[PDB]
Design an enzyme around this catalytic site. Structure first.
Site, PDB file in Angstrom:
ATOM      1  N   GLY D   9       6.061   1.013  -0.246  1.00 40.50           N
ATOM      2  CA  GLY D   9       6.281  -0.548  -0.444  1.00 40.50           C
ATOM      3  C   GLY D   9       5.293  -1.004  -1.601  1.00 40.50           C
ATOM      4  O   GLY D   9       5.112  -2.211  -1.791  1.00 40.50           O
ATOM      5  N   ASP D 117       6.160 -11.614  -0.341  1.00 37.45           N
ATOM      6  CA  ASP D 117       5.797 -11.913  -1.794  1.00 37.45           C
ATOM      7  C   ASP D 117       6.716 -12.981  -2.632  1.00 37.45           C
ATOM      8  O   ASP D 117       6.629 -12.816  -3.881  1.00 37.45           O
ATOM      9  CB  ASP D 117       5.281 -10.561  -2.477  1.00 37.45           C
ATOM     10  CG  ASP D 117       4.323 -10.007  -1.849  1.00 37.45           C
ATOM     11  OD1 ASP D 117       3.098 -10.559  -1.553  1.00 37.45           O
ATOM     12  OD2 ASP D 117       4.306  -8.605  -1.738  1.00 37.45           O
ATOM     13  N   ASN D 255       1.284   2.074   4.078  1.00 36.24           N
ATOM     14  CA  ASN D 255       1.682   1.979   2.458  1.00 36.24           C
ATOM     15  C   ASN D 255       0.468   2.544   1.785  1.00 36.24           C
ATOM     16  O   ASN D 255      -0.445   2.102   1.575  1.00 36.24           O
ATOM     17  CB  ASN D 255       1.489   0.372   2.255  1.00 36.24           C
ATOM     18  CG  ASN D 255       2.480   0.099   0.865  1.00 36.24           C
ATOM     19  OD1 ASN D 255       2.971   0.814   0.236  1.00 36.24           O
ATOM     20  ND2 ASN D 255       1.731  -0.952   0.255  1.00 36.24           N
TER      21      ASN D 255
HETATM   22  C1  LIG Z   1       4.500  -7.010   4.635  1.00 32.42           C
HETATM   23  C2  LIG Z   1       3.850  -6.207   3.783  1.00 32.42           C
HETATM   24  N1  LIG Z   1       4.239  -6.165   2.330  1.00 32.42           N
HETATM   25  C3  LIG Z   1       3.400  -6.358   1.232  1.00 32.42           C
HETATM   26  N2  LIG Z   1       3.578  -6.208  -0.049  1.00 32.42           N
HETATM   27  C4  LIG Z   1       2.487  -5.948  -0.892  1.00 32.42           C
HETATM   28  C5  LIG Z   1       2.632  -4.839  -1.276  1.00 32.42           C
HETATM   29  O1  LIG Z   1       3.710  -4.047  -2.167  1.00 32.42           O
HETATM   30  C6  LIG Z   1       1.345  -4.193  -1.766  1.00 32.42           C
HETATM   31  O2  LIG Z   1       1.248  -2.655  -1.830  1.00 32.42           O
HETATM   32  C7  LIG Z   1       0.290  -4.469  -0.906  1.00 32.42           C
HETATM   33  C8  LIG Z   1      -1.234  -4.247  -1.166  1.00 32.42           C
HETATM   34  F1  LIG Z   1      -1.867  -3.173  -0.540  1.00 32.42           F
HETATM   35  F2  LIG Z   1      -1.389  -4.282  -2.621  1.00 32.42           F
HETATM   36  O3  LIG Z   1       0.329  -5.803  -0.908  1.00 32.42           O
HETATM   37  C9  LIG Z   1       1.617  -6.437  -0.526  1.00 32.42           C
HETATM   38  S1  LIG Z   1       1.702  -6.430   1.434  1.00 32.42           S
END
Ligand SMILES: CCNC1=N[C@@H]2[C@@H](O)[C@H](O)[C@@H](C(F)F)O[C@@H]2S1
Ligand SMILES: CCNC1=N[C@@H]2[C@@H](O)[C@H](O)[C@@H](C(F)F)O[C@@H]2S1
EC number: 3.2.1.169
Lengths: 117, 309, 109, 309
Positions: D9, D117, D255
């Site tokens: 993700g 986001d 992730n």
């Molecule tokens: C519900 C979670 N969804 C998210 N989307 C983003 C991810 O694409 C990133 O990898 C992450 C971070 F580690 F950069 O920040 C946010 S957390």
């Protein structure tokens, strides 16, 4: 359409020069920004509306481009198109008027902060 | 003879074999003739230059040089040993000969040695052996070229590859002085113009290099290169270089956008410029405005043809 | 060696915490910097740091000769950058947006 | 009962099908059980969610889902329409139904709707029709959930996905209150903890969240995530999450780093943590230093097996 790509290339033209359409549009947003009583309010909204029209022409083209049969050309450059589409939405809207990142580099970066160069 | 085509020499994700083959199709279609393989982030070109190819890698490189040859496209193989080569060590040179030997077994006849984005500092051992940086590269390049049986197309890329990189200036550079004086006449020299990404490449500035390097260079154009900024893409026409430049160059290789598909106008307009003064003797013959009209006209039909990612 | 990956993991550890071997080097280098009969001390610490700096370079080259290029190729971009910084840290001790940017630079932010 | 595995993700280059098949082989080996497909820069997932798959795209997704089932791995397919979906438009819900319908003909039985986001502001049309943003997402999520015959596993991802992201705070959040109230009991909610990349995820932090969402959350952990900085990689152990957390969550999905091969320790250490307390009461059982040693010890042998690039 042909005119669509002309507008497209003008936005992503050359490193020292933007295309005519891209430079025309930038000049107008910069003009609007620089501007009973005096009748120059007639020219400002007539010029703001003609600009809000151009902000909808460029954004129509973008949506059009995204529906092209060639998904190969589109996937390679759309990330750039998606940025300028977002910067022109809030420009049109303008006219109409956590934590691990901020301490970048990691270990290599932490060491660099103690170095002259 | 004039080498005109593309140089995949950008920082970032290198192109796939499929894209490199279609490129030779577009190059041949637009009457272009050369391709310089130089991906900065292709570990076997820079970082891990010493590392020999695997079976699969050899097979893929074999299929590609086959495709190149088939589409009348000259495949020039480049290597950058400069980040950590020891110029005095004959084990480092023996390794460079083995790797280029392996590449010639793949059907490659044209080659290059790039010393472009490196520091001028030499390790103590190379200082004891070589009288300057410029001598270290020239000695290693001339040995390699001769070893490879003096290939017709052999390119050399200097550390001071543009006006701005020259210390103190272009005419007084002791580095270029040595390059032109001691680098074999059969070896070609890459040049990017007055700066890296040049706004214009004047006829005068090329005469200045041609005197010091003792030959007409091959341009390694960065007009459409976009690896230096994530938010920038170049779809405009090949503009800034006069057509009067063709009878003063051994070639023009364009280093375009990292995104293979976005380079239709970059290569299309380059073809138009070359063909406009293809037989020059010693801009009235080319108009970037015009070339762009035709490049988009032909690009527009492509967006209409179904292709799946 | 297992001791190499312990160093490798210590240099590229966690977002808020560095591994012990990484945290040790930074502290020793943070100490050498803040200093100028205490000569024999600094010199003993500057010479022993060069050895650690030198051995870390050893592990860095050892890794580049790995049989598994698939693993290596994925994470060596980081290794090379810490290797560049590690050599000049040691050598120190021895001593603009396009049309998108043009517009966004005029928007309220 | 417990969804434990990996979530692709992050932003950047999504993994390839060969790597994804290897992930399942590794997950199965480490007694893990889940894979959430959410690559942000894979256009058919986020930017171009309306776009249907081609024959080739369908074919490899067919093989991948097959591979997942063979390796006993739960393949949850996610889609993020949030950046441009018109929630009141029935043409938009029809598109999401056809898109997830095509994916259920590939072998998929687990899906997810992601609203992370994205700007909280709704378009003119969505404001008339929906009370708030929280209502619009939940009406679409629920209609989709029921349309897909209420799958066993369906995950929901909020805009306010960490502690920090809740307006005004987690406890007084009107959005989460809506989410836990109106979102169906069979749909799970993803939570990253007190921050995006949480240094610790306290047992209190999640107990407080489960109160508002009226269910135990699935953690989308970003401990080993490295997309937010080119200069950082994370090979350290799983650290900050008490083994006491497992009887309080419906899952944990890490992730990790964008580079697939740099995730061994990341996924190895997680599995040591999940297996240390996979039967509990609603750190005595696990130590990062110990699990780290066990992970690097096995990883070491992998570096010795000849694998050509
Ligand atoms: C519900 C979670 N969804 C998210 N989307 C983003 C991810 O694409 C990133 O990898 C992450 C971070 F580690 F950069 O920040 C946010 S957390
Ligand atoms: C013979 C010149 N060699 C060069 N090497 C670099 C290239 O990898 C880049 O693509 C180019 C771009 F940044 F302008 O800049 C320089 S020019």
């Amino acid at each position: 359409t042909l005119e669509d790509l002309q507008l497209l290339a003008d936005l992503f033209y050359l490193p020292y020069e933007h295309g005519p359409k891209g430079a025309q549009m930038l000049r107008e947003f910069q003009w609007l920004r620089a501007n009973k009583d005096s009748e120059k309010i007639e020219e400002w909204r007539s010029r703001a509306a003609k600009f809000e029209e151009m902000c909808g022409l460029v954004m129509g083209m973008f949506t059009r481009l995204s529906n092209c049969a060639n998904r190969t050309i589109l996937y390679d450059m759309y990330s750039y198109v998606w940025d300028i589409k977002s910067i022109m939405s809030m420009v049109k809207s303008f006219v109409q008027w956590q934590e691990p990142w901020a301490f970048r580099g990691g270990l290599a970066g932490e060491f660099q902060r103690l170095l002259p160069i | 003879r004039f080498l005109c085509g593309v140089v995949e020499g950008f920082y970032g994700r290198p192109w796939v074999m499929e894209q490199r083959k279609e490129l030779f199709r577009r190059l041949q279609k637009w009457e272009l003739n050369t391709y310089l393989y130089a991906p900065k982030d292709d570990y076997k070109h820079r970082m891990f230059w010493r590392e020999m190819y695997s079976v699969e890698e050899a097979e893929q490189l074999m299929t590609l040089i086959s495709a190149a040859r088939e589409y009348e496209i000259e495949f020039i193989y480049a290597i950058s040993p400069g980040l950590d080569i020891t110029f005095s060590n004959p084990k480092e040179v023996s390794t460079l000969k083995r790797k280029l030997d392996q590449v010639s077994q793949f059907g490659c006849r044209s080659f290059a040695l790039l010393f472009d984005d490196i520091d001028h500092n030499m390790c103590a051992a190379d200082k004891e052996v070589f009288s300057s940086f410029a001598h270290a590269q020239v000695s290693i390049t001339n040995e390699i070229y001769q070893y490879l049986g003096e290939p017709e197309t052999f390119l050399f890329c200097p550390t001071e590859y543009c006006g701005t990189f020259c210390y103190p200036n272009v005419s007084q550079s002791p580095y270029l002085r040595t390059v032109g004086e001691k680098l074999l006449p059969g070896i070609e020299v890459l040049w990017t113009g007055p700066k890296v990404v040049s706004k214009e490449i004047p006829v005068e500035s090329i005469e200045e290099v041609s005197k010091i390097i003792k030959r007409a260079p091959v341009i390694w154009d960065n007009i459409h290169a976009n690896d230096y900024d994530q938010k920038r893409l170049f779809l405009g026409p090949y503009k800034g270089r006069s057509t009067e430049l063709i009878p003063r160059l051994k070639g023009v290789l364009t280093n375009p956008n990292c995104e293979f598909e976005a380079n239709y106008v970059a290569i299309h307009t380059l073809a138009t410029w070359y063909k406009s003064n293809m037989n020059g003797v010693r801009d009235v013959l080319y108009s970037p405005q015009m070339a762009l009209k035709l490049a988009l006209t032909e690009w527009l039909q492509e967006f209409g043809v179904p292709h799946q990612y």
